[PDB]
Amino acid sequence: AACHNHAPXMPPXYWEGEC
Secondary structure (H helix, E strand, O other), X not given: OOXXXXXXXXXXXXXXXXX
C-alpha cells in the first residue's frame, strides 16, 4: 500500500474500496 498506514489513504478511491 502506498499509504503504508493502511488508512486513511491519500489515493482517492485508488483501492476502489476505502472510498
